[PDB]
Every structure is written in C-alpha cells, then in structure tokens.
Amino acid sequence: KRESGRKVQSGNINAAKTIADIIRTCLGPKSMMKMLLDPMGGIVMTNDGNAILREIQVQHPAAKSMIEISRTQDEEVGDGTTSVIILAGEMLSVAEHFLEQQMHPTVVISAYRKALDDMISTLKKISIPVDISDSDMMLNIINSSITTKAISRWSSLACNIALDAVKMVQFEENGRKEIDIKKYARVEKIPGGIIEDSCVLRGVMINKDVTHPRMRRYIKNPRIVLLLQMEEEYIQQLCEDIIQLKPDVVITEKGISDLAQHYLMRANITAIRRVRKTDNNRIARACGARIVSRPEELREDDVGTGAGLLEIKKIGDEYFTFITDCKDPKACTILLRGASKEILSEVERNLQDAMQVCRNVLLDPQLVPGGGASEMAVAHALTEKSKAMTGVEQWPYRAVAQALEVIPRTLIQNCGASTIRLLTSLRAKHTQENCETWGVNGETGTLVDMKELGIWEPLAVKLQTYKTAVETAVLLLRIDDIVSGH
Amino acid sequence: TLNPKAEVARAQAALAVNISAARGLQDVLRTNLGPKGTMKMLVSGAGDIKLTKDGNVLLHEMQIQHPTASLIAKVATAQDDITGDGTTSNVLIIGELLKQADLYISEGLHPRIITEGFEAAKEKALQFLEEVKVSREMDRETLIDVARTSLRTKVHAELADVLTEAVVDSILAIKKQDEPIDLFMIEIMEMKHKSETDTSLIRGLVLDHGARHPDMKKRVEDAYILTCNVSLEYEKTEVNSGFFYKSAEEREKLVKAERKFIEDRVKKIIELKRKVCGDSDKGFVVINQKGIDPFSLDALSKEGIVALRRAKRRNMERLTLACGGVALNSFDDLSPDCLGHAGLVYEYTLGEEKFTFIEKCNNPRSVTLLIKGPNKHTLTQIKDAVRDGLRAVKNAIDDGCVVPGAGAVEVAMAEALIKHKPSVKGRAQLGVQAFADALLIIPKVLAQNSGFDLQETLVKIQAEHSESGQLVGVDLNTGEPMVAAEVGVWDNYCVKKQLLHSCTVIATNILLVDEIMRAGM
Amino acid sequence: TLNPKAEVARAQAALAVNISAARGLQDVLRTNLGPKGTMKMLVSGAGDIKLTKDGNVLLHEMQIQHPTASLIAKVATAQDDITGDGTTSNVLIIGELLKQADLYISEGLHPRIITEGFEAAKEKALQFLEEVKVSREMDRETLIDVARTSLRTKVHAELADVLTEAVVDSILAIKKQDEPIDLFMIEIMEMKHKSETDTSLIRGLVLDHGARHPDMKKRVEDAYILTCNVSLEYEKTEVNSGFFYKSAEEREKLVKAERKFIEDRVKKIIELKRKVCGDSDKGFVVINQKGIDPFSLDALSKEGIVALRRAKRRNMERLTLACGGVALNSFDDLSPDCLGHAGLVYEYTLGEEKFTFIEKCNNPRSVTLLIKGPNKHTLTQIKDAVRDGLRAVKNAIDDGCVVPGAGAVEVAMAEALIKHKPSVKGRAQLGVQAFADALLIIPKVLAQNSGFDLQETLVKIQAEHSESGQLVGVDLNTGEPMVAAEVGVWDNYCVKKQLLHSCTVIATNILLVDEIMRAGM
C-alpha cells in the first residue's frame, strides 16, 4: 500500500547495495564472470555490467532507478557504468549515520554535495594534459579498450578509424566542440572483405539496392533531387517536373510505387525511396541540395552541385549508392568490411566505444590516474579537508572518502592479493608521495605508478561518474515515501 | 537483502555448483574412453536406440539436466568441428582441472591465480609437443596404425581391420598433387540385407534407383554416359495451347497428343546412341535424373541402353565428373558434347532391392564407401566411426606430424611441467601442479576401463625413465608399460594441440564465475 | 546384517567417520598454535573459568563429545608425559595425514598401502632430523631462546622476560657436573594481592603455617634447623595409668602430670638451644610438624625462637634435604648431631596470610619459584607455562641437540620426502606424498593465526634454496621467511622425534579401522 519513514531509506539502501554487490567483481581486467540462469535453462557467462542488469528483472523501484541511470550513462559515455553503481551503492552502504545516529537526509545531502564540489576540485589538480596532435600518444590510450578484442590484429587501423571519424565530426569552430557519433558518423555493415578493408567515406551512404539497370553508374556532378488511368496521370505529371531538370538521382522522402518508378526509369536515374526527414537534411548538406514540399514546386536550384560523384558499385553481392565528396560536409560514414556477419558485429560495437573514448578525450584534453589512484588521491584531500570542517557534517563527509576506496578494493580482490595489506600501504603512499601516481596493478595485483603504466583515463568519465553516483545517492536518500497511484 | 523473484549465490558456492557438474560429467564419459571402454545408449523417447562411444554424440544429441553441464556440451561441438577427435578426453581434463582447483580454493586461494598457472603450463605444454612430435612421412603402414587407433575406439575390434584398409585407401584415392583433402569427395552409402563385416570400397558412385526392365543389360563394360535433367513422362503442354476435352475418350486423345512431346525426344536418345560409336563392341548409358515413362524404358532397352531415373542433384554432379557429359536441360539441343565415358556399370542385387554401380571410372576424383549392416542402429554406429576415422587420417596428412598415444604425452608433459618454475609469480606454481595432475586422468581412466588398478598402472609408466628420449604408455591388455612407437599407437598433433587450448580456456572461464544469477528463470 | 539392540558400519563409511572426527578436532586446535594463536576457555559448569593454549589441557580436562576424537585426546596425554610439548601439532598432523589419505582412498586405494608409506616416510624423516639438529653447548644465551620460544606460546608476550629468567635460573641451580636432573626439586607456589608481573624466584622454600606468639622474631639471619615430628600439645598419659579422679579439678590436676612428659621435653629443646650457640647475634628455629601448646610456645618465644607447627608432609620433606636437620621422633634422644643450619629465615607478611621463607642456603638441592597474580585462573595458566618452560629447558639440556622451529624442520623434511623415490613398494610413495603434505600444516597454521595468507607464506619459505644449509621459517610479525636459528627460535629434538613416532602410529591405526561396532551400547 504505502511505505514511509526510515523504512524507505533503509530499503533503498539494501536495494542499491544489492545491485552493486552483484557487479563488484566485474571491474577491471580480471572481471569475474556471472552465470545467469534463464527460465529455459539457457546460460550466458558474460561479464559486462550493462548486459547483466539489462536482463535481470527487478521489482524494487529504487533498484530500477539505479539501473536506468547507468543505462543513460552508457549512451552519453561508453565507459564507467560499473563504477557508477558500485560507488553509488557504497556511498549509500554507510547507514551508521541514517539510523543509529538519526541524522536527517538533508544533513547528509549537504555533506554529499559539499564533497562532490571538493571531489571535482581534487581531480583537476591531479590531471595531466594531452598532446592529441600526436597519433601515437592517443593510440596508447585507445589500446586500453582494444586489448582482448578481435580488432587487435589491425588495432592501428581501428584507432585511425575512430580518431579521424571523431575529428571530422569535431566542430571546434563553435567553441563547445560538439560531437555526435550517431548523427554525423553513421555506421553500417558491408558483407564481404575483411577488417583491413574498413575505411571512412566522406559523405552519406544509402543501402538501397539497384533493381533495374536504367540508372546512373558514374556521374561527375550529382544532381541529387530532394522532395489506373488517374493514378497514371497524377503520377505522369509529378514525375514530369523531376525529369525536366535532367537529374542524376531522385531521393524522395515517401514511397515511389511501381508506376512512379516506371517514368523515373525512362529518365535513366537511380530510384531511391523510404528515407527519413533528418536523413534528407544530411543528404542536402552532403551536396548542397534543397528539400521541396512537392515535385510540382521543384526549381532549377534543386541540384547537388559540388559533390564528388554518384556510384552504384556492387560490393559483395549487394549494391550500394554513394553521394560522397572529396571534402568534409559535416559528416562521414564508416564502411565496415568483413568476410562474415560474425566478425562484422564484433567490429561494429568495438569501434563504437572506441569513438566514445576519443570523444571524451578530445572534448577536454585532460586525463587522470586510474587503477584506484584517482580514488585514493581524492579521498586523501577530503580526509585532510574534513579536519577544518566544523560541524556534525564532518562524519558523513569523511565516509564518502572511504567509500571511494571500493574501486581499488575490488581490483585487489579480483587479483587475489590481501585487500587490507595493500590498501593500507596504498593509502600511506598517497599521504607522503605524490597523489597523481601510486595506484594499483590490475594484472599483477601489487602497487605500481601510473606514470610507468598507461592506465590514464579521461577526466569527463570520472566527473560524470562521481557526479552521477552522488546525485543518485542524493536522489534515493530524498525518497522517504514510496506510494502507489495511477 | 534481495528482491522478489530473484536469487544469487554471492559466496563461492557458484564454483561448488559448477565444479560438481564437471565432476558428474567426468564420471559419465570416463567409462567410454578407448576401445576397452563401455558404450552408452541414446534413447530418443520414441523407441529408437543408438549406441556410441563418441563424446560429441553423447553431448550434442543427448539432453543434460544441469545448466552448467550444457556449456561444456557446446564445447565438444566446437572441438569436433576443428579436429574431429578428443571430445571425451576434453571433458575429463576439465573435471580433473576443476577438481584440483577446488582443493586449493578451499585453502583460500583465489581462482584468478589458478588460471594464470594454467596459461603458463599450457604454453609450456604446447612446446613439449613440438619436441616429441614425429614428422614421419605418410605411408600405408603409418596410416593403418592411425586409423586403427581411431576405429578401434568405435567398434568391437572386429570391424577395425576391415574398416582400416578401406578408410586408408579412401583418402589415398583422393590424396594426390599435394591438394587439400576434401571430405566431400567421399560419399557414404548404407545398405541392409547383409552383415556388418561386408563393408568394402567402391571405386565409383552408387545410386539408389536403377534400371527396372527385363530387356536391360545386367552389366555395361563401357558406355557414353549422357547426362540429362529432362522428364520423359507425361508432362503439361509446353506450346501455346492447353488441355480441353469433352469426355474420357477425348481426354485420352490429349494424352496421345501430349505424349508426342516425349516420343520425338525418346527417339532422339536412339539417334545419339547410333551416332556416337553405334557399331558393335560399343554401348550407351543414360543417367537422366528426372522421371522416365515405362515406354521410354521399354523402347531404349530394345536398343541395348541402360537408362536410370529419379536421382539426386549431388549424384548428378559427381556423375558428370566421373563420365564427362554435361547436363542437357532440353533434348532439342542434343549433341555429343553432353556425353562421357565409364567402365563396368553393373547392378548389385540384394534380397529385395537392387543398386546401380558405376565402377571403373577414368578421372572421377571421387569415390564411395559402401557400408553394409543388418540393423539400422549399426549403420549409424559404423558411419560415425568412419567419419571419425577419415578425419583422423585427414589430420595426419594435412598435418604431417603425429604424436604418441596411450597417455604417453600426458605422462611426459606432467613430468615436464613439474620441472618448470613460474616467471610471473610464485603462487602460479599451484596452478601448474593442478595442470600436471589433471593430464594424468587419461592414463588413469584407461587403466580403469581395462579392468586394472588405477594406481599400479600409472606408477609403472611414470616410474619408467632412462637416459634417452623414451616414450611410455598404458597397455590396455596387460596393464604394464608400453612404448607406443613400438606397437603402432599414434594420435594427431592438432588433437592434442587443440585439447590443451580448449581445456585451459573452459576450465579457466568456469573458475572465473563468481556468482550465478537467475534472469527470471 | 546385525543383531538387535546394536549397530554396525560394514562399508568404508566407518573410516570416513574417523576421518571427519580428526578433521573437526584439527579445526578446533589450529587456532591456538603459537604465540599469536587464540585461547580456548574451559567452563567447568560449576562456575570456574580457565583460559589456556596447552593442547594437553584442551584434550585431557576438556571432555569430548565424539567417541573417536576422545582416543586422540588420550594420545595427547601420552605425548605430554614424555616430552611435555607438541600435543597441538600432533593433532594437526594427524588431521592432515588422514585428510590426504582420503584423497587417495576415494580413488580405490587400500589403507594398508598408505600406512606402509608413512613407515617409510617416518624413517627418512627421522634420519633427516639427525642432520638438522644442532649439538651446540647449552648456555644461558641459548636456554633463554628455548624458554622464550616455549613461554611465548602460553602468555601475552608480557610475562616473557619475567618468567624467562626465572625458568632458566631455576634449572641451572639444580644441575652441575653432568648430574641427572629432576624438576621435582623446584617448588611452585602461588600468592595473591600482587600483579601478574610480580613473579620472582625463591632460593629457599616457602612454608604454609607460621609462628603464633607476639614475641616472635620476624627474621632470623642465622639458626640451626631442628626437625621434629612430636606433638607438643596435650597428649595422653605415656605410662601405664588412666584417669583416677574424684571431680573435674582432680581430672585437670592429672592433666598437669600428663603435661609433664611434654613440658619437660620443651626444656630439652631450650637446653640444646642454649648449648648450640645460644649466645648473642645467634638464633634457633624449630620446624616441628605436629602441634605445639600455647603455653609451651611462650617458653620458646621468649628465648628468641621462631617456631612452626601443623606443617605438611611435603614441607618437612624439602626442609630436611634443604637444611639437613634429621627428624627426631622423640625428644628423649635429643642430640646436636640431628641439627641443620640455614641463613636468613623470615616470614613475609601478605595482606591476608603469611608464609615463612628460609632463603640464603648453601646448596639445599631444592628451590622454589614464587608465582604472583590477581586471579585464580591466571595463576593456573602461569603454573602450566612454567612447567612447560622448565621441561623445554630440561629437554634441551638432557638432549643436548636442538632443532629449528617455526616449521623450518617440517618444510625441510617435506622437501626431502618428495626427493625420495620408492624403496619398499611402488604405491607406497602415495603415502610418502601424504606424509609430506601433512608436515606442511604446521607453517600453514602459523600463517593463519598470525593473520597472513596461508599460501603466500608457505610458497616463499619453499622457494628459499641455496648451495648450503638453509632452514627458513614463518615470521609471525613479517610473514616473510626467517632463519629460525639466527633469530633465536629453537625446538627440542625429542619433541619433533616423538611427533613422527606418535603421528604415524595413530594415523596408521585409525586408517586400519574397518568397522565400528557397538559392544552393547
């Protein structure tokens, strides 16, 4: 019916903590596997935090909010989904203040928000710039994701794809450096070939197939148009104004039936159909064409002058229409080649996340020391800053710092080493030695500096990770009454 | 701390469940290892019965209750497609690897440390094969020991000597010019009405349907085989007309009028017969796949022509390569170009049915292995053995190197891994010890199935050492040590190579399972 | 197959019942091995609490519910009677010996084969112990390392330096010129009203009952000790008479005549006092075990005598051999030849009671160790540690050879057994391997109780190898390897020697148990 009081906040903690305890060991290169029992006996031993919670059906509303936020994190950022849930769960697992001490949530939220502003201030001090102009330096960063993948055979090609494709979409003239992989870097699979034939196309691609030979095979100046008896006459006139301009290809938004394709085939042009509105806007920017209301209102200006060429070359038992150019019309297209669909699927998702890494690094050329170094470094600042924190908020303020130790805690647990012994010595290193280094080795299990090991992560990934974990913990703590109602 | 309709084993019980499943699957398949091993029955529920020791059939066709064990069942499907053997021993090593890992995990050792020991022992284990592999040139005697080593593990030791010479010669018939061996060049045919030991090779193809008419030649020593795909039976009107009748008699006139579509073409077969060497001491054969009227079978038989009907597409492609005549899709464009040439073409007579044989071909680049058995399940049993015996000789020729058997490599690699220290950390020494004792399950199980003591047999072959490269294995008949090279017991290189890479990958991944969550089961 | 009112376990499950009991008793005592090990409580039910780590006390005084486990408790009693140490390590090796044997017995191995391997591993392990033992001379610097190693395992690392110097000096006072030693020469006293760290030595002896008169001397710097056993209280008529009276006062008048036999003997005591150095700056002490009359005590008190009465048989025994005064059973034969001599003789007053001390003796061949503590159970805990510390210094002195500790001998012997091929039977090496792994439980448990990883500690000490004598042990504070001979950790030769003889015999006999029958239970 209705649940209120401390029962609500104590329940949301157990829910978010339970979801975090599942994926504690799926962090780092030693990500432990999880066996999901399907109702039909099917089993998948995946170790991805997203796919695990995606398939696990939950009933608690608080656990759903913790999952949906990680999903939204996965789209905006291609990394850090597992760390958001572990930190958000660990930040909430400190229930000593909520129940035993009877601290109001508004007091803790004042402490969590104060720590978030200080946690962000501590990361930017330990940051390090990047020489993004160097292709080998940025290549050393993208190799962290290429490891243990099928694209490791030609990783140099895999980085050059994502690195240039993002830079082509990178619009630095407007200042904010807006990047949109899904909008301006459309990716499509091409049957046949191999991973080595994967290249970038400087324009828009149309996956429609050629049904009849009466079409333009090669044109230097693509004129791209953009827009039974009674059916014949109404179609005979709408097609007349199109052919009057002598086009090279007609890309209409809505469908082109058989009789409409008949008159278009008399003009010997490629028949394209079933395209969306935004796609037409991208087609127009590819060649400078004009979208018109109806075929009746077509004018001589409706041309794709300036484009490179039109081509309907058959590649691997499939025709492909290209309106590409030898310039940069605010977009690109990744033509992923592969001898089979099994290899094509892996390279698609692999290079997609690789573009997200370069997207975050290029939005701000500032990295941070991973392997628990950033967490233990930030925790040292709050523990020192809390000494001057006059008030009762000092106790939960310090607890947030110790909650960040979970990241090196899980990395040490998966390696099999002593968690207390290394974490104790790890915290001492950040006190005396520099905080920008002395993290954790995820492969060896012992301590190591991050200057000697290139585990440097982006800054925007950690900022949105801590900001989302704190805002998620602040969210569920503000929930004090779960009620029904339609 | 849990949600409704959800369950998860957060502690190490997830490993105890997966480790228990592998031990259970180990105890099942260990009884069918080798020739002395027992057989397993496969009841389909509807009443069918199938006996087989092949681990892939006991994992692909059979159904398993445990969800975790079904994962290892899919691995055998992968192990079979790459090498064609080693699916049973792959499951034993996984169970014994996980068994030894559970012994150390109970002592507080992390699973990830054990997997690093397997990766180090595996890389050392692969190098040991390169040192002991014998790159003996492929000959008849060498392949007999290899095919005997494979076929004895699927039969009652009586069809081994019979099937060995047949399986060896089948590959040698297609193996020449250093070409990659293709198994599509050998077709497998089954026949009832005879015993099991009557299996023998056929130099050419064999067809189901043959000539059915009294006026046919029982054997054609030579003929110009004509390949065709045109039906010489009652068909529809192929011209700009149709069927319109007013009674049963007027309908019969349309049959006489429609039959003229074939009667002009049936004589066309008689024309090319008389045309291309129609004189004495010659013959002619038709292998038209489609149906043929008894009139055309009755007409051409008077001219001394063996005509066949109702064949398969695959047989027609093989028939063209054996003879040389290209398929004619329409009798109107007949010519000598559509003809071939072959030797003795006779008819094998069984108790009830009869089969066509096209032996003595010129250049077919293909043969057929005629299987005979009294029971239905015995045919499927022998077929699975020959397919495994063919891949055994294929791997021996495709990969010219072979290695010993009888667990001699496992006994040797176990001693090699013990004399090898890590290079990444010290605790990996435990994983190497688990890998060493895991490989010994094969010589242990072979002693159990043969009825000998598990410990006495292993200690003898493991204690046997000398100041020279010496092999040693289990003697299934005596139980004493045995040098596999001195008796003709050889395995493949790719089998043992894929075994170490397969067991290490799956035993690793099963150990990395930290929790088991029900996805709404 | 059994009679009513009884039960029988026919199959091998009877052996698993005994293996499970030893495994359980192993997990109980492993937490109290070494100094860093935890303590166990002994609730007597009546209300007495007792804390101790001594495995002999946790098995002898603690009654065990399981029938099988009570047998091993009786062996710990026998182990403590010979050497007085190693009872805890004895049970841990028995638990691991039977644990490792079950791994091979489950594979179909007979128990009798494993036991024959233990007999072979024992002889090899016993011969290797002769090489590791150090036959150096026993000096105060060495016995302190033995006493510290023995006392640390029974105290809170605070009474180490307190009881170490007392335990060592108590032994050196009772051995010279290679004389046989006896721990009964050392008396163990207990007193309250002082902190636990107030333990110290007493060169002389402590007596229970003190003098009773106000004019007594609190300290006698010199006196002749007169041993007596005559009741100086009112006694019966010593002549052939009775009680010939007419009232109560006449009966009392005869009691005066009955006291003439005792009162005159008090004058004989005063006579020899004045004769044997009754001058100034001298004294005299009487230690008569029996009672003394109050009026007679007034006579001796005024003469400066410190008298004692109502003593125990144990006090008079040590008082004789210490002071030399011969017991006079009748004052008629009083003479100065029966007199002893001693130095300072004083009565230290405690808050509640008092005790007489006879310190400053020349060579009494008997001493006393005075323990002080606030509680009752704390005194019993310290009494057990001193007896275990004295017996440890006794064994090192009698058996001049000592061996390193911290599991360095177990790690070295285990490496020797693994480097030992079969010599009695081929399958016997499986028991030798089980014996090797059983010895490694000692360093494993020391790593657990110290809080370090069980596997990392054992692997580091095992990796220590060089071209020279190298014996490393478990550093409880560091966890790294540690040469036990360098830091000052030394165990006895009889302790490790009796462990191999005790562990093998019991682990053997428990393995030979085939059935468990009820003898009318």
Portion 265-304 of B in contact with A at CB < 8 A: none
Is residue A151 domain-shared with residue A268, that is, in the same domain? Answer: no
Tokens at B421, concatenated: 């220290």
Tokens at B491, concatenated: 């395995």
Cα-based angle A115, A69, A43 (whole degrees, multiple of 5): 125
Q: What residues of chain B lie within 8 A of the CB of C421, using their CB?
A: 463
Question: Whole-angstrom Cα distance, residue C453 to residue A416?
Answer: 10
Is residue A23 domain-shared with residue A141, that is, in the same domain? Answer: no
Cross-chain residue pair B455–C422, CB shorter than 8 Å: no
Q: What residues of chain B lie within 8 A of the CB of C427, using their CB?
A: 455-456, 459
Chain B nearest CA to A44, separation (Å): 9
Is residue A237 domain-shared with residue A295, that is, in the same domain? Answer: yes
* Residues forming a β-bridge with C187: C368
Is residue A430 domain-shared with residue A470, that is, in the same domain? Answer: yes
Cross-chain residue pair A416–B109, CB shorter than 8 Å: yes
Of B107, B454, B455, the CB nearest to C454: B107
Chain B nearest CA to A174, separation (Å): 46
Cross-chain residue pair B108–C454, CB shorter than 8 Å: yes
Cross-chain residue pair B455–C109, CB shorter than 8 Å: yes
Cα first-last separation, chain C: 17
3-class SS of residue B43: coil
Q: Is B89 annotated as a binding residue?
A: yes
Chain B nearest CA to A36, separation (Å): 4
- The answer to whether C98 and C108 have CB atoms below 8 angstroms apart is no
Domain boundaries, chain C: 1-136+401-521, 137-203+365-400, 204-364
Is residue A336 domain-shared with residue A196, that is, in the same domain? Answer: yes
Q: What residues of chain C lie within 8 A of the CB of B427, using their CB?
A: 455-456, 459
Which chain A residue lies closest to B17 (C-alpha atoms)?
A: A35
Q: At what angle are helices A394-403 and A105-125 packed, to 10 degrees? A: 50
Q: Is the dihedral of CA C212, C217, C218, C221 positive or negative?
A: negative
Question: Whole-angstrom Cα distance, residue B409 to residue B495?
Answer: 12
Is residue A375 domain-shared with residue A361, that is, in the same domain? Answer: no
Which chain C residue lies closest to B444 (C-alpha atoms)?
A: C107
Structural domains counted in chain A: 3
Cross-chain residue pair B517–A41, CB shorter than 8 Å: no
Question: Whole-angstrom Cα distance, residue B86 to residue B79?
Answer: 7
A:B CB pairs within 8 Å: 94
Chain B nearest CA to A125, separation (Å): 35
Please count the CA atoms within 13 angstroms of the CA of C469 that sit on its side-chain side.
Answer: 10
Give partners of B (≥3 CB pairs < 8 A): A, C
Cross-chain residue pair A37–B521, CB shorter than 8 Å: yes
Q: Is B85 annotated as a binding residue?
A: yes
Is residue A20 domain-shared with residue A166, that is, in the same domain? Answer: no
Question: Whole-angstrom Cα distance, residue C99 to residue B103?
Answer: 11
Tokens at B163, concatenated: 């099937």
User: In sequence order, which residues have a C-beta less than 8 Å from that of residue A96 and are 6 or more positions away?
Assistant: A399
- Structure determination method: cryo-EM
Question: Whole-angstrom Cα distance, residue B453 to residue B461?
Answer: 13
Is residue A233 domain-shared with residue A307, that is, in the same domain? Answer: yes
Tokens at B125, concatenated: 């284990």
3-class SS of residue B364: coil
Q: At what angle are helices B441-449 and B408-418 packed, to 10 degrees? A: 150
Cross-chain residue pair C455–B430, CB shorter than 8 Å: yes
Tokens at C154, concatenated: 């029974």
Of A321, A349, A365, which residue constitutes the final position of a domain? Answer: A365
- Best B5, B8, B424 residue to mutate vs chain A (most A CBs within 10 Å): B8
3-class SS of residue C334: coil
Cα-flanking dihedrals φ and ψ of residue A391, to 5°? 140, 175
Cross-chain residue pair B455–C429, CB shorter than 8 Å: no
* Whether B108 contacts chain C with CB within 8 A: yes
Is residue A38 domain-shared with residue A117, that is, in the same domain? Answer: yes
Q: In b/e form, how buried is each residue of C490-514, taking b as 16+ CB within 10 angstroms?
A: bbbbbbbbbbbebbbbbbbebbeee
User: In sequence order, which residues have a C-beta less than 8 Å from that of residue B466 and are 6 or more positions away?
Assistant: none
Tokens at B434, concatenated: 């688990």
Q: In b/e form, how buried is each residue of A65-74, taking b as 16+ CB within 10 angstroms?
A: bbbebbeebb
Is residue A193 domain-shared with residue A339, that is, in the same domain? Answer: yes
Tell me the structure's resolution in angstroms, rounded to a single decimal: 3.1
To which residue do tokens 């394209």 refer?
A: A272
CA-based nearest residue to B492, from B393, B380, B362, B385: B393
- The answer to whether B412 and B481 have CB atoms below 8 angstroms apart is no
- The answer to whether B218 and B305 have CB atoms below 8 angstroms apart is no
For residue C305, the tally of other CB atoms under 10 A from its CB is 25
3-class SS of residue C367: strand
Q: What residues of chain C lie within 8 A of the CB of B109, using their CB?
A: 455
User: Which are the catalytic amino acids of B?
Assistant: 54, 87-88, 388
Is residue A189 domain-shared with residue A298, that is, in the same domain? Answer: no
* Whether A18 contacts chain B with CB within 8 A: yes
Of C427, C454, C459, the CB nearest to B455: C427
Is residue A314 domain-shared with residue A342, that is, in the same domain? Answer: no
DSSP-assigned letters across all residues of A257-284: -HHHHHHHHHTT-EEE----HHHHHHHH
Q: Is B44 annotated as a binding residue?
A: no
Q: Is the dihedral of CA B25, B27, B29, B34 positive or negative?
A: positive
For residue A352, the tally of other CB atoms under 10 A from its CB is 16
Cross-chain residue pair A34–B515, CB shorter than 8 Å: yes
The torsion angle over the Cα atoms of residues C171, C172, C176 and C180, rounded to 10 degrees, is 10
By CB atoms closer than 10 A (0-12, 13-18, 19+), residue C461 is buried
Per the structure, the complete domain to which residue A176 belongs is given by 131-201+330-365
To which residue do tokens 């909008």 refer?
A: A183
